[PDB]
Design a protein around this ligand. Structure first.
Ligand SMILES: Nc1ccn([C@H]2C[C@H](O)[C@@H](COP(=O)(O)O)O2)c(=O)n1
Ligand SMILES: Nc1ccn([C@H]2C[C@H](O)[C@@H](COP(=O)(O)O)O2)c(=O)n1
Ligand SMILES: [Mg+2]
Ligand SMILES: [Mg+2]
Lengths: 192, 190
């Protein structure tokens, strides 16, 4: 049983996956923000840091997968699907030029490129996510303007909508109480 | 028969490999500098460009490998990390950014050559060969860069001498004599 957990910053992936974990007894794949050495300067100056950051992320996510395929039962807090989403956001915002974007996408498919039983999309409005970053995120995520969070969220919907038929997506209203979200996830899991 | 051609900038890899090609009838794998969109600004400002550039290179080199019995490789994926290390020793890419690449290179990126032909050459010759046969971009950066690169090529050969079927060619010699030496080594494996 392999469970991807899917959604923007402050959707509540760590919360939801930690809860699933307690209930099922599975480990969480969690690229920990506290070990990422780019994160601290990242938001202070997006133009300079993003490319390198996005590269570090593929490296980190790909290294975990050399350990994830050993195990029958996993929970993924974010997947390798979601990483290109972050690069596209910065591109639409003119924070990484065309060339640097082409390099990544080209790269992503012909260098980097994984079969989830379910992809749980924690669907959430940007307001809630923004306040959940304030409540539960980190120091650094407070630094950048909110337009960034709006485009990211818009780009998550966009991604779900392009790929809805290609992945075993299951949408959870992430506006709901955590208890009710977990209840909904457990019943879907029990039925597969 | 898979032939890697190995050495620093201006050793004469394109010349040597084009010659081998004519003699054997094999295609050349040549990451063409004219298609690399980073190259033009690359040398003008190494700190800004190198990381991205070195990433583009692994991508390009890895994409070619997704393409066959008889090949000649003008530069291999072995030599790419050499360029990143050069810029690191020169403080042109910090520790973090170097760690990211090396980490990456092994656990993301990582291919069996019958021969690795090391076109061994002094930096003076290479510098004058860039001067007459490279391009305008390679003229822009100082020479210390070429000296460390060359030093780092020897270093690499010396660490890996036993792990790859290395064959050293005195690249100071005439092209005709180099080709003569390569063909005889090739004939004695073929
Ligand atoms: N490809 C990625 C993945 C993550 N992050 C950053 C965005 C978040 O601020 C932080 C942690 O992600 P999350 O809060 O969704 O768990 O990592 C990023 O910039 N690019
Ligand atoms: N990993 C690499 C590979 C190549 N180059 C640049 C250095 C050379 O100036 C140019 C062409 O290589 P050569 O003339 O040795 O064939 O490509 C680079 O900066 N980093
Ligand atoms: Mg999280
Ligand atoms: Mg060449």
């Amino acid at each position: 049983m392999k469970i991807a957990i899917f959604g923007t910053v402050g959707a509540g992936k760590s919360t939801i996956s930690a809860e699933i974990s307690k209930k099922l007894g599975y480990e969480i794949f969690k690229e920990p923000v506290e070990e990422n050495p780019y994160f601290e300067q990242y938001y202070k100056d997006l133009k300079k840091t993003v490319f390198k950051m996005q590269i570090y992320m593929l490296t980190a996510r790909s290294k975990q997968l050399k350990q994830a395929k050993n195990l029958e039962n996993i929970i993924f807090d974010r997947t390798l699907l979601e990483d290109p989403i972050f690069m596209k956001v910065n591109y639409d915002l003119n924070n990484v030029d065309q060339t640097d974007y082409n390099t990544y996408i080209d790269f992503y498919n012909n260098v980097v490129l994984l079969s989830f039983d379910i992809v749980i999309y924690l669907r959430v409005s940007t307001k809630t996510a923004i306040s959940r970053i304030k409540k539960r995120g980190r120091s650094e995520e407070l630094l950048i303007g909110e337009e960034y969070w709006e485009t990211l969220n818009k780009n998550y919907e966009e991604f779900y909508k392009q790929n809805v038929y290609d992945f075993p997506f299951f949408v959870v209203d992430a506006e709901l109480d955590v208890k009710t979200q977990i209840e909904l996830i457990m019943n879907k899991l029990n039925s597969i």
